[PDB]
Amino acid sequence: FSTHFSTLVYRNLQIAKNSYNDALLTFVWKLVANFRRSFTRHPLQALFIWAILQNKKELSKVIWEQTKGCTLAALGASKLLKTLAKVKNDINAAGESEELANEYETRAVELFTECYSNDEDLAEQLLVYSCEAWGGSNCLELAVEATDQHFIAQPGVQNFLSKQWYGEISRDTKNWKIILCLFIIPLVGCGLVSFRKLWYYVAFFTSPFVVFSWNVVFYIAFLLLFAYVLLMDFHSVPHTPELILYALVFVLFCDEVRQWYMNGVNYFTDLWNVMDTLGLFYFIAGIVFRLHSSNKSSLYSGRVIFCLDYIIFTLRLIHIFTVSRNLGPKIIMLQRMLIDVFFFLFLFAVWMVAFGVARQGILRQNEQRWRWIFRSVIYEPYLAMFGQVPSDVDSTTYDFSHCTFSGNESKPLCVELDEHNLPRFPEWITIPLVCIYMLSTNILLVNLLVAMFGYTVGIVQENNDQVWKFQRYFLVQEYCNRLNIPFPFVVFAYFYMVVKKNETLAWEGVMKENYLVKINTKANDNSEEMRHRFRQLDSKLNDLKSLLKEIANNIK
């Protein structure tokens, strides 16, 4: 690690690991420093890391094959390779790093198949295992923090996560019957429904699946009640349901605060949490506004903010419900397709601005009013693109003889000063421009987006499912972190917590040996034994010729 390690890659690795945003990188740096500073133990892990670092694919593969912890070693090696590959700007080093990382990732993925098939329980036990001094973390813990969605997308991992989410519920009943079984208190009557493969009564509530269903029911009920409180009744002095609304919203805010506390760093990076945080930030301002009635209408203004935040809560309703069996995958692709929306908005907006520019050319020499110039230029073409073309002001409605030339009058629209009482605006160019804008926007740009959207779906539809499956894991993990607890008892439990606050490896090795035998058989399946048979035949012919020569010599 000191003499033969060299310094070409060591310096770059140390510099990048000083600040790499990876705990595995920090552990590797610490191990390297200990090895250099020194001048279970897990030494083979250090040897394998050394082999991997200098891009020795065959040597690294052999050393990994010798090491006992094949699966976890391969997973972490692929993670580290993918993490450190791109720090170097070389176009040659990057290619080799990516190739090796992909090879090792696919290697581990293909290895895990035989282990899962031979013994599902053995695989389940193996996945959740803390490592010893080599960045100790379970298989899925590395996989999720390693990208590599291919490994986690395999059917066995998905089935494991499905059973984990199910928990203490035996999957032997229809989904609709189970959903109806949630609403019924006693489980004795529902004999047909497969609860298992009062104790067993209380076992049901512990399932995270049931907790999620209860959570969405409670959230939708909360949304409906909050909307009723906001709109139906509002007074200068707050009343009972408003106080209960404050109580409930603070319950949700405290739950989110606890989630932030558990993982501070990822909270800021995560996009979804930001929207709800902003909504709460506006909601507290809503309360501030409703506190004191400084002005007679000063309460309506705050109610406006209350409503604006209500919109964000409506959006969060979809956010939480993302993953729902066959329903969930459709949501993800919209995020990728939003680029088309952005491009369409820009392209349409420029045409909108031009047509609004040319709409005002008909109008008087000088508008002299930001209000109406902006209002018209924005609003009119905005309808034309959707419906009820605005140019009817000039062409379809001809001249309505209703203009407020004086700026004092707040009357929409006007007409250029007629010459000698004659409407000066000429149709022969204005109306054609209206037609051109209509053709450009209503029937071309709109019908473009459908086509565009088309290609966006079919090309990326195959991958989408995988992502959904990945997303599924997250929710499970989240609901695995909080275990099971009703929301109102959840708040109390959070407060109470705040107050308080071998043989499997051998089996894996045997399965790996079997897998290596299978790989060797696949390699040998070329069926080129005829060449060796021909070589043996030639050798036999040479031996026969030599025997004949010896016989001839003996005769002579």
Summarize the annotated binding site for Ca(2+) as residue ranges: 256, 259, 273, 276
Chain centroid offset of residue 347 CA: 28
Q: Which of 102, 118, 138, 442 binds a second copy (CB under 8 A)?
A: 442
What residue 273 binds from a second copy, Ca ion, none (CB within 5 to 8 A, per partner kind)? Ca ion
Cβ 359 vs Cβ 390: under 8 Å:
yes
Q: 529 exposed, middle or buried (CB, 10 Å; 0-12, 13-18, 19+)?
A: exposed
Spatial CA neighbour of 87 closest among 22, 30, 38 = 22
Residue from 273, 360, 464, 477 binding Ca ion (CB under 5 A): 273
475/493 with CB nearer Ca ion: 475
Using the minimum distance from each CB to a second copy, give the nearer residue, 198 or 459: 459
285 binds a second copy (CB under 8 A): no
In the bound state with a second copy, the residue whose beta carbon lies nearer, of 180 and 353, is 353
407 lies in the binding site for a second copy (CB under 8 A)? no
Q: Is 399 in the site for a second copy (CB under 8 A)?
A: no
The listed partner (a second copy, Ca ion, none) that binds 357, CB under 5 to 8 Å by sort, is a second copy
Stretch that binds a second copy, among 45-53, 62-70, 277-285, 347-355 (CB under 8 A): 347-355
Using the contact rule CB under 5 A, the part of the chain among 35-43, 244-252, 270-278, 386-394 near Ca ion is: 270-278
> What angle is formed at CA 79 by the lines to CA 76 and CA 80, rounded to 5 degrees?
90
- Only one of the segments 155-163, 282-290, 324-332, 500-508 lies at the binding site for a second copy (rule: CB under 8 A); that segment is 324-332
Identify which range of 51-59, 166-174, 337-345, 489-497 contacts a second copy by CB under 8 A.
337-345
Residue 551 binds a second copy, judged by CB under 8 A: yes
What letter represents residue 98's amino acid? E
What Cα–Cα distance (Å) separates residue 549 from each residue in 46, 535, 544, 546, 554? 62, 21, 9, 5, 9
Helix (H, G, I), strand (E, B) or coil at 394: coil
Q: At what angle do helices 23-38 and 70-84 cross, to 10 degrees?
A: 100
Binding flag, residue 132, a second copy (CB under 8 A):
no
Among positions 205-264, residues that touch a second copy (CB under 8 A) are 227, 230-235
| Cβ burial 63-89 (10 Å sphere, 16+ → b, else e) | bbeebebbbbbbbbbbbbbbbbbeeee
CA distance 508 to 115: 7
Q: Supply φ then ψ for residue 419, to 5 degrees.
A: -90, 115
Cα–Cα distance for residue pair 68/184, rounded to 1 Å: 50
Q: Which is nearer to a second copy, 132 or 399 (CB)?
A: 399
Output Rg (C-alpha) for the chain, integer angstroms: 36
The 356-375 contact track toward a second copy, x by CB under 8 A, reads -xx-xx---xxxx----x--
Interacting residue with a second copy among 12, 426, 497, 514 (CB under 8 A): 426
Q: Of 19-27, 160-168, 283-291, 418-426, which segment contacts a second copy by CB under 8 A? A: 418-426
State the binding string over 495-534 for a second copy (x if CB under 8 A, else -): -----------------------------------xx-xx
Q: Distance between CA 451 and CA 264 in Å, rounded?
A: 43
The residue among 244, 174, 254, 164 whose CA lies nearest residue 478 is: 164
